Design goal:
alpha/beta, TIM Barrel, eight-stranded parallel barrel, three-stranded mixed sheet, 17 helices, binds alpha-D-glucopyranosyl fluoride, binds zinc ion, prunasin beta-glucosidase activity, protein homodimerization activity
């Protein structure tokens, strides 16, 4: 049977199922409704930065169609919707003046979701730093971001928190550090060789530290000022792709573990244990900032749940640990990526080159967090795969590969849960085909097809798969 034994009965009672989007990727109205530009608006509008010179000006136009999209998610039997608030839609300059039309939009969305029995899970930040804050303060390089983010978060708690009870601060600060400041391929396009300037060996760590400090400050504000009345929760969303030792050799096993530590431990060790991973301290040394005891105590325990974005897996090959001139966060790991073992690829690829379809990676990741971090409450906040550009509507709708993807990954998640992992929910990236950053509209992650000429929505087979699986 195409559900493969999966249904709500196959998951814990009250387990949450949802879909996910992000503001810039679906809203549109990027320069309308009072919204100020984000760093992604400037980036996307620069010729050559995005596939086809595309941008999120219109995107899926969810801004005008949100009731259609909410009706669709309810008809597909989902319990929840993870979306983000655009910082520059509320504060066009990131600070000071409030854009009331922006506030009204999120009020309207949140109220309609609740009207339809859909639980809002709200991200405050998804790659979309107000451009004004980048220019005035230097964005995530400036420790002042803690105050600036806290003030923004405070406004959101005050304005929406009587209705919103499930918050996330950030989405994937590792990717911001990696792509924005190590490789320099996402805004602000910083790296050692980059035209904008930078230092791939230092800036990724500065940025990560400031994300953690800003997270902790925003949560401290929530807990001291809003929690008593509002009785909600605040977490953070982290990407974690699985790393598997190429062989059982001491050095390959060490390499896979180093990769885990530099990937997820970088944030989870501070959040759970109040310090950076030991290996990062040992290898990165004085390029890794130190939490004072007070900061570490503010950071530790500051996530009510951990959002995990899980997509793929890689084999890791080791080497003798070397004394090396620092060059980048990426080279700091001292590992070698490998995508085949015993003559077989780890998995076939989806449309995105980085996305190897490896369902057991999901078990790997969830089991690892359970065993290593005292089984914290985890929410899978994104999981999915993409189709390529240029297909016919019908070809998009017959997404049999995506159906197989969800059945397999969810079976592996069920396996980890049945072994005792504290996973509270699962969210499919994405409800809709949308703006896939550098790939623009050439990558289609949705369970619902979006015709980007007419903006019409059409559920794909995977959407119907979810509807069947999730019926009450
Ligand atoms: O790459 C697919 C998807 O991966 C993660 F979920 C990111 O948070 C999204 O912004 C992105 O679109
Ligand atoms: Zn419109």
């Amino acid at each position: 049977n195409w559900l493969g034994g999966l249904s709500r009965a196959a998951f814990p009672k009250r387990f949450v199922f949802g879909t996910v989007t992000s503001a810039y990727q679906v809203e549109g109205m990027a320069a309308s409704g009072g919204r100020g530009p984000s760093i992604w608006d400037a980036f996307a509008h620069t010729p050559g930065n995005v596939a086809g010179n595309q941008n999120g000006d219109v995107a899926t136009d969810q801004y005008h169609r949100y009731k259609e999209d909410v009706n669709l998610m309810k008809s597909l039997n989902f319990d929840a919707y993870r979306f983000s608030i655009s910082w520059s839609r509320i504060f066009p300059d990131g600070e000071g003046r409030v854009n009331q039309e922006g506030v009204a939009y999120y009020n309207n969305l949140i109220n309609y979701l609740l009207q339809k029995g859909i639980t809002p899970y709200v991200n405050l930040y998804h790659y979309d730093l107000p451009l004004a804050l980048e220019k005035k303060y230097g964005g995530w390089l400036n420790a002042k971001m803690a105050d600036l983010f806290t003030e923004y978060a405070d406004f959101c708690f005050k304005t929406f928190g009587n209705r919103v009870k499930h918050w996330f601060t950030f989405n994937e600060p590792r990717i911001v550090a990696l792509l924005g400041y190590d490789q320099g391929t996402n805004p602000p396009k910083r790296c050692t060789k980059c035209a904008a300037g930078g230092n791939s060996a230092t800036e990724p760590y500065i940025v990560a530290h400031n994300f953690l400090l800003s997270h902790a400050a925003a949560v401290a504000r929530y807990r001291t000022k809003y929690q008593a009345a509002q009785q909600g929760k605040v977490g953070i969303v982290l990407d974690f792709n699985w790393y598997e030792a190429l062989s059982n050799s001491t050095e390959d096993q060490a390499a896979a573990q180093r990769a885990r530590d530099f990937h997820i431990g970088w944030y989870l060790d501070p959040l759970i244990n109040g310090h950076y991973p030991q290996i990062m301290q040992d290898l990165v040394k004085d390029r890794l900032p130190k939490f004072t005891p007070e900061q570490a105590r503010l950071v530790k325990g500051s996530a009510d749940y951990i959002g995990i974005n899980q997509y793929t897996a890689s084999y890791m090959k080791g080497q003798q640990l070397m004394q090396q001139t620092p060059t980048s966060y990426s080279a700091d790991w001292q590992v070698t990526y490998v995508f085949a073992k015993n003559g077989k690829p780890i998995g076939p690829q989806a449309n995105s080159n980085w996305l190897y379809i490896v369902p057991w990676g999901m078990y790997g990741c969830v089991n690892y967090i359970k065993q290593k971090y005292g089984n914290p409450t985890v929410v899978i906040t994104a999981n999915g795969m993409d189709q390529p550009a240029n297909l016919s509507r019908d070809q998009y709708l017959r997404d049999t590969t995506r159906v197989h993807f969800y059945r397999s990954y969810l079976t592996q998640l069920k396996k980890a849960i049945d072994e005792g992992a504290n996973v509270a929910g699962y969210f499919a990236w994405s409800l809709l085909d949308n703006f896939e950053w550098l790939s623009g509209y050439t990558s289609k992650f949705g369970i619902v097809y979006v015709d980007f000429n007419t903006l019409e929505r059409h559920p794909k087979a995977s959407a119907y798969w979810f509807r069947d699986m999730l019926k009450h």
